[PDB]
């Protein structure tokens with residue numbers, strides 16, 4: 117069962133936001149160098165497949181340079197039941213968009229703490245003001261939580277508005293979506309790239325965005341930009357089916 121956490125997540129009372137309830141985001145992955153340094157996030161979407169951002173892989177096209185950590189809450193002192201799986205192959209999206217698939221060397225073991233996220237239907241458009249969640253271990257910019265998995269609940273901003281001069285001034289593609297608090301203070305940041313933007317739909321969480329870029333982090337009128345997963349579901353499914 118994708119999208120349904122065994123440990124239920126909690127809202128807040130990553131810059132700002134709050135520390136997640138441990139293991140409430142069981143599809144969250146830590147992308148690390150073959151030396152063990154965290155540098156990006158990802159999302160488990162099936163036992164053998166992780167979705168991340170293509171820019172997270174710019175340094176090396178060799179699958180050997182990457183390892184995936186699953187089931188973690190601490191970033192440094194990894195808990196014992198954490199799964200560390202090597203990457204067997206890399207699939208960059210073929211039209212140069214900021215999304216990529218990692219095929220794991222072995223299927224992740226599905227547990228209470230490691231569960232895949234669900235994928236959306238093709239071309240679904242998250243509606244304006246939908247409150248979704250972003251998660252990760254990235255920079256906190258003096259906001260507490262460093263070293264622990266953090267979350268933030270952010271409203272989606274429809275592309276027609278996000279592209280106005282007052283916000284991102286024509287920079288956002290239809291294959292991307294915008295989310296964030298326009299007053300600033302809470303945002304994904306460096307170290308969170310490649311990680312998930314999930315939305316609650318009926319009874320489970322659906323992966324709708326991949327953390328990609330922004331004009332800074334948590335600045336006023338500068339919401340984060342995410343790859344719009346629904347525009348790549350058909351590609352993703354074809355890669356999994358044929359590999």
Ligand SMILES: NCc1ccc(CNC(=O)[C@@H]2Cc3ccc(cc3)NC(=O)CCN3CCN(CCC(=O)Nc4ccc(cc4)C[C@@H](NS(=O)(=O)c4cccc(Cl)c4)C(=O)N2)CC3)cc1
Nearest residue numbers: 171214287303304305306309328329330331332333340341
């Ligand atoms: N929730 C906020 C947030 C969350 C998580 C993060 C981590 N992710 C990054 O770090 C990305 C990495 C990256 C690089 C290239 C790329 C995609 C992602 N895609 C192409 O290469 C594809 C080719 N074209 C690129 C241009 N595009 C036109 C629209 C446009 O201009 N897109 C920008 C893209 C990158 C930047 C700026 C603009 C540069 C920097 N932004 S930054 O202001 O300098 C900065 C951010 C954070 C901290 C600091 Cl200190 C500085 C920036 O985000 N890099 C069309 C396609 C950051 C922000």
